[PDB]
Amino acid sequence: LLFDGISTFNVNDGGEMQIERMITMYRTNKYGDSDPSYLNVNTIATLSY
Amino acid sequence: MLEETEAALLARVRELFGATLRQVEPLTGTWTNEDVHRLFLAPPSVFLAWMGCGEGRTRREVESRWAFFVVAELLNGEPVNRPGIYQIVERLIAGVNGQTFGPTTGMRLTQVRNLCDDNRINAGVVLYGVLFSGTTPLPSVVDLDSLDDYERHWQTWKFPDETPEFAAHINVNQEK
């Protein structure tokens, strides 16, 4: 799922729901290809900041 | 700043000698073996010739090497006025020693050659030649001046080419 573009989440012990990796649904460059320059939500958030 | 310096030396020579020297004129190139048959000597006269510049102390100054070629007439193997030519050479050395001439300063006497071989003896001219070395600076960087109102600031983050562009067109002095 992280490869496909949908973020994930972990269910740790104690019935708690974690975040794992928040990723943006960006996997394809302009002409097909594969670009990780926007994969992390941290990347776009830091660009905005 | 060489041309200003040579103008300064020429003006100084004119002021010092006046009508004693028939003329003064800058010389293109050092005195070769055919300058006698090519120049308008009109002796007695002195020629200022730039002999180049050796390396100076810094990267902004050089040791310019100038030369004063003094000419006269030696009719019948006899100088026209030996006291006159000796006084001309001597006063040229004295008045152009140490004294600054425009940007160049520290004019130091280096050599005086008799510089009269057969080519000039059979041509009826003496060519006592003085040399000088001076600490002349290089010209400074040309200044600039412009005033344009700062209104726009265009920044572009260097992302991969076909990655979607990220930029900010700031446009300062905008009020809202």
DSSP line for B75-110: GGGS-TTHHHHHHHHHHHHHHTSS--BTTBEEEEEE
Smallest Cα–Cα separation from B27: which of B18, B13, B38? B38
Spatial distance between the Cα atoms of B28 and B50, rounded to a whole number of angstroms = 8
Q: DSSP letter for A46, please.
A: H
The CA distance from B161 to A23, in Å, is 22
Q: In this structure, what token pair is assigned to residue B104?
A: 């160049």
Rounded-to-integer distance, Cα A5 and Cα A23, Å: 7
Task: Characterize the bridge pairing of strands B129-137 and B105-113.
Answer: antiparallel
CA A24, CA B39: separation in Å to the nearest integer?
86
Partners of residue B156 in chain A, C-beta under 8 Å: none
- C-alpha to C-alpha distances, B13 to B16, B39, B176, nearest whole angstrom: 5, 20, 72
**Resolution of this entry in Å?**
3.8
Strand order in the sheet with B105-113: B23-26, B45-55, B61-71, B129-137, B105-113
CA-CA distance, B136 to B25, in Å (whole number)?
21
B163–A35 CB contact, under 8 Å: yes
Task: Chain A: give the shortest CA distance to residue B57, in Å.
Answer: 52
Query: How close B172 comes to chain A (CA, Å)?
Result: 19
Give the residue from A24, A30, A48 with the most B CB atoms within 10 Å of its CB, the best one to mutate.
A30
Element (H, E) at A47: helix A41-48
DSSP H helical ranges for chain B = 2-17, 82-95, 118-121
Element (H, E) at A48: helix A41-48
Record: contact A35-B157, CB cut-off 8 A: no
Residue of B157, B163, B166 lying closest to A29 (CB–CB): B163
Tokens found for residue A1: 């799922």
CB proximity A49 to B under 8 Å: no
Q: Which residues are CB-neighbours of B140 under 8 A, at least 6 positions away?
A: none
Q: How was this structure determined?
A: cryo-EM
Chain B contact probe: residue of A24, A34, A35, A49 with most B CBs at under 10 A: A35
Tokens linked to B145: 């001046």
Amino acid (one-letter) located at B32: T
Do B163 and A30 make contact, defined as CB atoms within 8 angstroms?
yes
